[PDB]
Every structure is written in C-alpha cells, then in structure tokens.
Design a protein around this nucleic acid. Structure first.
Lengths: 176, 159, 104, 168
RNA sequence: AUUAGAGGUCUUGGGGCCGAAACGAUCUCAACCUAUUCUCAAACUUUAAAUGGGUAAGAAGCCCGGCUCGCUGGUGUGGAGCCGGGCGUGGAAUGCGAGUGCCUAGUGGGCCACUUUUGGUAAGCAGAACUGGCGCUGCGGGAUGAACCGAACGCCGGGUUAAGGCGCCCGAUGCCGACGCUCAUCAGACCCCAGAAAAGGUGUUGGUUGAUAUAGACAGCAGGAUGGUGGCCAUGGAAGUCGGAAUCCGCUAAGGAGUGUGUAACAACUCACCUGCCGAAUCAACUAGCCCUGAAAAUGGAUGGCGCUGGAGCGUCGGGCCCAUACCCGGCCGUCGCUGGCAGUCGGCAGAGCGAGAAAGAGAGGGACGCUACGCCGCGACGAGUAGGAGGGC
RNA sequence: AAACCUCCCGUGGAGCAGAAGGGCAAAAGCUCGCUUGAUCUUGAUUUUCAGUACGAAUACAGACCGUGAAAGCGGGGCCU
RNA sequence: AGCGUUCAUAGCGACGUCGCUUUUUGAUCCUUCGAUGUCGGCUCUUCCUAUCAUUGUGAAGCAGAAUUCACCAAGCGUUG
RNA sequence: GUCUACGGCCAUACCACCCUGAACGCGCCCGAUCUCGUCUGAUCUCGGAAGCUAAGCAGGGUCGGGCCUGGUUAGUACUUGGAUGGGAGACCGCCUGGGAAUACCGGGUGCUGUAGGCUU
C-alpha cells in the first residue's frame, strides 16, 4: 500500500460466506487508512487474514464506506500505535501528532515514519488511532502547543517567488 | 549420465503404502474390464509380472484387448513434441476403473431424464453446465449485535 | 577443448512451433494386437453373418410395421412486440397497410 | 447491510507490450483477443473467466465498466467483425445484418446486450472487434506494479472508468 | 546420528567397605531397562503442500429390437461382431477455419538473466532445470554498454504515452510543491552496476523498557553527621576508621555499633543519611535512522561533468511538464486476405436497377470513362531479420 | 558367553547367489516329494529409441509336457 | 582467557571472529598462435605509503641516554 | 437379538487384562479298528459323544496402548506469479493466489453380502 496523497479512513465490515454448517457468520469491522477504497478492501483482507483464518475467496465485504471527521475545525491531539519493520527486527511505537482529521494525522505519520526511520508504507501496520486530551500527551514537540497564550514570530522569512523578477535590482528583504 | 534401467528411480513409485503390504485384496482381481473402458494405471510393487513401465504410472488410457490375466491399453505418451497413442499389456493388479468418465455418464442420465421430462410439461429446463456465476445481491442482517472491531495485535519477540 | 554436454533449453519452444498434436483420432481403430483366439472366432461370426439374412429382413419388416400401426393409432411488453410484428418484412405486409391510409 | 450483486461485466485492457512474455500468459492474452498493447475488450465474469484474469494480472488493467463507459466505447471506438473484416459501425444495418438473429438490430440493442450481460452476450461481444484505445492521456502511475500498491495493473474495480475516459 | 539429567533392578560387572563368606546389608561406580529431554539427515520417514502430469465434459453418444459365432458355457449363458429403428436444448467458459502429402536448405561451437540447483574458498569459473532474452535486432532510457528497464521497426503529419526524467550541459518544475532527516578537515546522490564488514560514537533524531520527582526532582553551593557506647568474644594497645561471629532504640527532618586517607589507641574530619535556595524531568539500560570512526596503491580523475548544503542530498508524497520507430487519427507504398467485384458498353429491336437485417420472380398465361480479363476496381488486416528458402524484375 | 532339549515373546528387526532399491509370513523364506515350461513355433507389444537394431522384458496363440485332488501354475532365476 | 613481579589493553595477546591488499603463489581460460621479442642486471624518469631516516607531535613498565607504540606526513634521502 | 459356513472392505476390526455368556452352533473333549501320518494319535487323518464352558470364540468393561476421525498448532512453515521493493550481504517485507505437519485437546472402537440355524 503506497501512502499516496492524503489518506482517508474507511469503515470496512465483512464476513465469511454462509456455509450449510454456519448459516450466518459473525461480522468483522475494521478502520482502514488508505488512498482509495479499492486498496482499502485489499488492506482489509490483509489484516483479517492475520487475525482470522479468512481469505478474500471465502469472505465478502458487506459494507465499504468512508468515515468522515466529526470535527474538522478543531485542533486535536492524536495518538498512534504502529508496528513498523526495520532492516533488523520489528518494533512497536507510540507516536503523537496534532492535526484536524484522523486521516490527516495518519498521513502525517507515514511521512514522518518515512523520514525518521526510512520505513516504507508497506512495512507499517497502524493498529490504533486514539485522539487524546491535551493533558494526556507525552511527546514534548506536541505538548509545547498547549498554551492559551501561545505567541511567536516568523524570524527568517525565506523568500518565495524568487524567480518572478529573476534579475532584480534591489536585494531582497528577509525581515517583516 | 544416468542409467537406462527399467525400474530406475521407482523407489517410492512402486513401493506399497504404509501398513498396506502383504497379500493383495481379492476385489481387484474380480473386477470386469470391457473394451473401451477408461482405465488409469498405477503400478503395484507386490506383483512383479506385467508391471507397466514407470512412464505410465499415473496415466489414463482405454482398454482395447482383454486376455486371461491382463488387458491391453492405449495410452498417450508425450515424446519430445509429439504424442504417441501406444499399446501396453499390463496385468490387472496395476489397474483401476477411472471415475473421471462416470460423472459425465451420470450427467447424461439427468439430461436424458430432464429432456423426456418437462417436454410434455413444456418447461424449458437448463441442461448445459454453467460456471459459478457472480453471487446475487442479498441483505445481511445484523440483528442485535454490532460488528466487533478488529485491530492488529502488537508485536512481541517470540524467541 | 571441452564443450556443452546436454541441454533441453530451446526444445520446448521448438516443439510448439508446429504444435504438439494429439494422435489422429479415428473411429474403427485397427484390430492389430488383439487376442488371436478372440480374433479367430470374431472372423467366423462375420463369415456366417449372411446365414441369418432372411431372418433379418423378415423380422425387420415387421419391426417397422410395429411402430407403423403404433403412431397411426395416435395419428417483454406488448407494445414492443406489436411494433416488431409490424416491422417484420414478410408477415407485416398486411399490418403496415393502414399506414397507407394514415397520411391520406 | 445490503450487499449489492457482484458485477457480471468487466472491461480488460492490455497495458504491457509483446516482448518477453511467458507462454502461458501469452496464450491467455490472445484468448481474450488482447494482442496489442492498449487493446480493450469486454469479459463476462464467472469462476472460469476470473481465474484466467488472475494469470495475466501483471499484464492487464481491468475493472467494472460504467454505463457511460460502455456508451462511449461502442459509439466512438466500435468496429464490427463482418466477414473477418474490421468495419466501422456507421449504421444500424451493419449490426442487423449480423446480429439480427438475436433481435439485436441497432446500437442500443448491442449496448443493452453488452451492459446487462444478456443471453447473447457471447455472439454480441465476439461481433465487436477488440477496441483499439489510445495511450492514456495524463500518464500512468506505474505500469509494472499492481494497482493496490500504487501501480496500474490488476483490478481497479470502479476506477476503470477514469482510465477509459483518458484512453478513449 | 545424538545431549543431558531422573526413576528402576543386581539384570550383570568394576575397587571395595562389616562381612571366612552369603542378590544379606553397605555406600557405591558402571553399563541395562522405563519414562522424559536437547539436536539433525541429498543417498531416512509416519505425515505432506504450492506449482505440476494424465483423462473426461456426447451423434464415433445414449436407448430399444433382431441375427451371426467354430469363442465362452448350469441357462438364446458371457462377450464380440453384425443389421434395423428411435432419439438434436450440438449438452462447461473463452478463442480460433482446419486437415493432409511431397520435396527441402541452413544448423548440429552457443551465450546471458530471474527463480531452482551440482562441484568449487571463490570467480566475468565449470555443469544442469524452467521461462524469457542475445545470437538474427534497430529504437526510448540506464553518461558509456551484445543480454538490464520500456518497447520491437514500411515512408510521413498531428496527438498521447511507456521506462526514465525536469539547476546548467540537456527537451521538461522559472511548482510561492508538502512533511521531515542530515554537516562530512573521505558528505551524499537511483534496478542490472561497477566498491566495503565486524565493532564503535555523551554527533543528532526518534522509539522501547525500568527507575526517582511538587509528603519537592537530578547537577551545584552549605550546614548537622550523634545519644546508650570508649559494644559484646578480642589483641602490649584499636573507642565505627587493622581483620571476623553479632548487628537494636530514645532525642529526630538525619546519622551505619560504619565508606577512604593516618597514629601504640586517642583528638579531628568526611561518608551513608538530613535540612536552605534555585524549580522543573532528571537517571539508567537498550533500540533504530542519517552522519562519523573502522577505511591503505601505485600516470592526473571522475554521483557522466560543472556544481549543489532553506539541496541540484536522503525518506515519504503530490500536481504540472518533457519524448520512442510503442499506442490513437490521417495520408502514401507494398504484401496478404476476401480463393471479393467487373463480359451489363444488355440504347427508338432503347428504358438508364440489384446497399437489401429476414429460404426465393422488377417471370409469363441523342447518351463521358472503361474491359493490355496476364486487365481494371473495392474493402479489410498487416510490414524486424543473419544462415537459409522462394517470387517478381519495362 | 556360546553344543543340544523344552516352553514363551517375537510385523520380519531374518532369509531370498551378488551391488543397492523395491517386494515377500499357512510365502517369494526354510524342509521334503515328484520333475525338466531353462523345450518346439508364429506374429503383437514394452524398454533404449530415430520411435532403427541388439539385449532384456510383458501379454497372448498353437504344440508337447511337468506338477497338483483340483482350480491352476510353469516356456528359467521375486523385480530392476 | 592470559603475559607483562603487581596490573586484561605501556607493549603484547590465546580460543574465536570481521576485513583489506593484488609487490606471493594458485584457480580460471575472456583477449592475442597470417607472432605483443619470453630471466636478470645496467641505464633513466615518475608514482604509491602499508614511514627506515629527517621536520612537527602524542604514549610508555619514558630519570638521563638509548629504544619501543601511535599521529599529520612521501618534501628529501635510503650507499660501497 | 445372535451364531455357523463362505466372504467383501482389511485395526473404528489390533494388543493387554477383567467380567458375563439362555438356546442352537462352534469348540474343548473321548478313542486308534479301518484311512492316513508322526521319534510321540501332540499336530495330521480317521471313529465317536461321557464330560465341560475352564480356554478358544462372542459380548461388555479399562480417566488403557494403538488405530480411526476432528480441533489446535495456523493463515504459521512453505509456495505460484509481480515490482527500478529493502539490505554490503545473508536474507527479509509487501502485492496476487494456494496453503501444511508434530506436540497439546476432543470424539469414535468394526460395518456388511449370500446361505442356513437358534431365541421355536
């Protein structure tokens, strides 16, 4: 699964096909973070095949729906539990992020896991996403934004649009 | 290079199954074989007379000649880019009736049954087999219970 | 001055250029290899088949007569199909004749 | 929950070339009439056909065609195999001359027999010459890997329509 | 093949031990047996896959009736062979015109790669299996290149792509690209591929686990650091300060009948331990990223080069854009196919038609061109090529 | 400790000329009795294979026999 | 682990294990058999550093002297 | 219900031990003249019918061994196809499909054809 673009959260629920032995098998629900719903269904079977003795040939998807954010206008603190794989052995991690959507926090994690540990998206098994209260966060890079009177400047404003007047006259100003 | 011995590399092919050695069950001997019977070949090591060559163990042919103790079979043998329907004389012990043809013979009966039947009724009843179709649309009831959540378990070093 | 010993590298490709054709199937396969005692008698059964010829045609004449007196003892919407009946070239001729009086 | 009926129709497109291809894969690809790259065709799905698509899944990119995707394909890129000659479907008499014995006497009849897989899908679908689509305007993600892993091959279920709008 | 202890019995034996001696006892030590236990097998195996190999999916099939036989026999029994008749929803999917016979050249040095695999320390080594390549083959990309990636080629116009790319060489990011990581006095920079390991870092970035902390943390800076007692067995002499059996309480926020440095023991001090301020994560052990050490060769020197450090580097990703002989549309050439069409130029002896979804009759009682038919015309599809074969050459 | 006798347990841990593998328990082993199918003669087929030979082998058929109460079995050696 | 009176690491370092080099020999047989003149010395230039000396320094079981280990380093020497 | 004779499948039927077996039957058993054969009437063959279910045999039992059949092991090991995936390598992850075997834990403990009895 390539973590292409911004991921979306899908609610995928599926079950074994009915056999004459068990008429109605129980339903199984998952929260999948995926680019599109087609790769969500495949990534669903990846996990179900690990926890249950089920395969796509013996099962069916009874509902493939996308779950939306209940508060896309509130800054939230997200806790993520991963299961990534290094070049030597696998590890469990607990990472915190600070975003508006759970799907946005998860994609924030794939890029960060790819930058910090060179872990590619196919080796990560995100297992739990919990939006935590600000008092219960642990990582300090997130805890420093819990301030009712947060205040800071933008010190060294890197010049953008540095090619519009490609040959200008005045030196650019980096103070505003 | 390898040898060209007749029973070369048949250490397990002609061996008897586990705890199945000893005298041969007599039902194999009292088994009729008409001409044109589809027959699959399986060499048995207990009887060394009339064994088929190892290149026919597992192949299936049809009977064309019946002697006192053996039958003649016409088997297809692939020889470097050409098939040869060649004749072998194998003794009964290395022979079974093939059940590959019977499921067709059985299907012919219902086809011949459901043709004279439902003809006077007029109802056109499907005869040809059809592949497994895409399954229909149905409703899945979640009466009461709600689908339980699945989450990947955390890793923990086994060894 | 050694060399390659043996290989079947290109052979499977060579075999399938003109196909691996199954032997020519043919009804009435030859009777070579059959038990001589069975074959010897089988040739006698053919040698005397004409002996019962008058019995054959006599029992065959009544056998066609048997079934002779036998059979003689016995002997999605309506709108679109309506238009398909008019649009038929042969059996719609008498149907698309009101149209001749329609423009008149 | 309401589980919809799993689809009966699929549109298959050959996305890899003709150089260095397995003998088993090559045989299946010509049983689907996909001998050129970017050649398309309709396939009715069942246990037999699906397992043929699993053999050539690195070489094709199939999915479930939309109704509009069937319209544009038949209308813009629809050529009939009349007397073993690729002839453009310019008027209905070309269809009725060949598919009349199945009450298919117009383009709509043919589109209906294709979309809702009918009793005469085989004869109708075999009447169409394999669609010769153009290269996909806008590019591809990756031709060599499967769709789910960020590529283009395999089953992209309903996203096949976006690919048809660009290839057609 | 093989490791280890257990539980057994004299089943026997090894030195004995009180036995002259005695399966009587005695500790034994061994094998032996019974339960377990560690570790394996190309030439072992109870089990046992995936991939794979046959066969079947009808008319040459089914179902009745009758004859023939010297074969076979309780028995018109068995079987086979013959006639005759009846059954067509053509009995899975998909695709596709098949069958068959002559004559026949070249070749019979091969090589490479994924996966499997034998010998070998290994090899751009030797030998196999499977498929695909190269050879016989250009083209886009990999700077360069027999084989890698894309894609196979008539001659062109337009469009669009693949694999690759988009600081400049050099077509395309001159995006208000996104999020991070990294400083190298040897940085790094893209399949094949053309260079590095164990080990190590208080470089930095994340994680895991376990401990102290607002009955106030850790650094730093200072003060109390005793009372029973100068303890009982001890030494000429050790009082907490040389060695070992012992190792409690009052006064208290705390002090051990004691952690180093010194005298024959003393005096003194520090230490464990406790308060004052500072006022918040400190400490430990791991782990993984980038970087660094490990890291030495000979002409001067190579991420392709220049150069690049708010990347032109590394990871994860977006839009946009660039172009192959590939794909799409169009033109033209040729080949192949339709075993296509055309003798109907049927004219005042005239009547101008067979493009029409539907087995078959426009049935009787003065007018361009053309058709060297070995000609002319219309549709489609297709086009690499060494050795070799054939045809056509106005 | 091993001579011979007896009982018990004994799925083959023995034996079957030889290498190894397969096969075998009222036998294919061991011990006796009678024997010469290790004979005469056509073709067919398998194995190696070019689907040619030789060798070896498998099913028959025609004889003549052996053995056994008999069904049968036997034209060399349980098979390679 | 030890050696080094004492003291693992001043200098060493077993049992193990990871590499580098192509100034040794092998292994291979790719190039050359219508020929690439096949041992040494002599002569002469240049390059490498895995540094013997010399410059500048670190460490010693460095008192001095002498000698060991290591660092930057191939500028200049290395003979009769 | 059950047995005998001949069987088919050839342990769900075997093995160890224990219990109970009406009737018929099968046996043990009693003999050696004849048939036949042994060192030996033990076996084999033959002629019998006093005794007995002790044994065989049949049935049942055992937290039985074995066997049969499941669960678990485990979507694990392995594996088809795929990638300009990772890694210096050894090897590993993913995609697409297929998918085992012990230990450990359950359940089961012969079905059956022909012919003839007995329980009348």
């Amino acid at each position: 699964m390539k973590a292409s673009g911004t991921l979306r959260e899908y609610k995928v629920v599926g079950r074994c096909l009915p056999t004459p032995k068990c008429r109605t098998p129980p339903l199984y629900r998952m929260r999948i973070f995926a680019p599109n719903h087609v790769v969500a269904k495949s990534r669903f079977w990846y996990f179900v095949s690990q926890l249950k003795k089920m395969k796509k040939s013996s099962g069916e998807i009874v509902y493939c729906g996308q779950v939306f954010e209940k508060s896309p206008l509130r800054v939230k603190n997200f806790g993520i539990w991963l299961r990534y794989d290094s070049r030597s052995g696998t590890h469990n991690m607990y990472r915190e992020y600070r975003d508006l959507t759970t799907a946005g926090a998860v994609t924030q994690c794939y890029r960060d896991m790819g930058a910090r540990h060179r872990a590619r998206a196919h080796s990560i098994q995100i297992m739990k996403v919990e939006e935590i209260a600000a008092s219960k966060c642990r990582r300090p890079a997130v805890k420093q934004f819990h301030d009712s009177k947060i205040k800071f400047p933008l010190p060294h404003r890197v010049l953008r649009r540095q090619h519009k007047p490609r040959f200008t006259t005045k030196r650019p100003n980096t103070f505003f | 290079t390898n040898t060209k011995g007749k029973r070369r590399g048949t250490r397990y092919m002609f061996s008897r199954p586990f705890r199945k050695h000893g005298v041969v069950p007599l039902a194999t001997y009292m088994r009729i074989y008409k001409k044109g019977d589809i027959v699959d070949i399986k060499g048995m090591g207990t009887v060394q007379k009339g064994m088929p060559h190892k290149c026919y163990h597992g192949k299936t042919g049809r009977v064309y000649n019946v002697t006192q103790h053996a039958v003649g079979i016409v088997v297809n043998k692939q020889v470097k880019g050409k098939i040869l329907a060649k004749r072998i004389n194998v003794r009964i012990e290395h022979i079974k009736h093939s059940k590959s043809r019977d499921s067709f013979l059985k299907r012919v009966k219902e086809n011949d049954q459901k043709k004279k039947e439902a003809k006077e009724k007029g109802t056109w009843v499907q005869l040809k087999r059809q592949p497994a179709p895409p399954r229909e649309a149905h409703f899945v009831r979640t009466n009461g219970k709600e689908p339980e959540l699945l989450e990947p378990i955390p890793y923990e070093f086994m060894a | 001055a050694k060399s390659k010993n043996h290989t079947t590298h290109n052979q499977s490709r060579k075999w399938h250029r003109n196909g691996i054709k199954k032997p020519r199937s043919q009804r009435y396969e030859s009777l070579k290899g059959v038990d001589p005692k069975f074959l010897r008698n089988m040739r006698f059964a053919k040698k005397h088949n004409k002996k019962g010829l008058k019995k054959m045609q006599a029992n065959n004449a009544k056998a066609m007569a048997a079934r002779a007196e036998a059979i003689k003892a016995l002997v999605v919407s309506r709108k679109l199909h309506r238009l398909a009946y008019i649009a038929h070239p042969k059996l719609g001729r008498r149907a698309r004749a009101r149209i001749a009086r329609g423009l008149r | 929950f309401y589980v919809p009926a799993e689809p009966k129709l699929a549109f298959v497109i050959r996305i890899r070339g003709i150089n260095g291809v397995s003998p088993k894969v090559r045989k299946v690809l010509q049983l689907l009439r996909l001998r050129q790259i970017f050649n398309g065709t309709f396939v009715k799905l069942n246990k037999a056909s699906i397992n043929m698509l699993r053999i050539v899944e690195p070489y094709i990119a199939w999915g479930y065609p939309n109704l509009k995707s069937v319209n544009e394909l038949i209308y813009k890129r629809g050529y009939g195999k009349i007397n073993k000659k690729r002839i453009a479907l310019t008027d209905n008499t070309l269809i009725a001359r060949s598919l009349g014995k199945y009450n298919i006497i117009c383009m709509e009849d043919l589109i209906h027999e294709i979309y809702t897989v009918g009793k005469h899908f085989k004869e109708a679908n075999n009447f169409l010459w394999p669609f010769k689509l153009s290269s996909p305007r806008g590019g591809m993600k990756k031709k060599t890997t499967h769709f789910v892993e960020g590529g283009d091959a395999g089953n992209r279920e309903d996203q096949i329509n976006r690919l048809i709008r660009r290839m057609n």
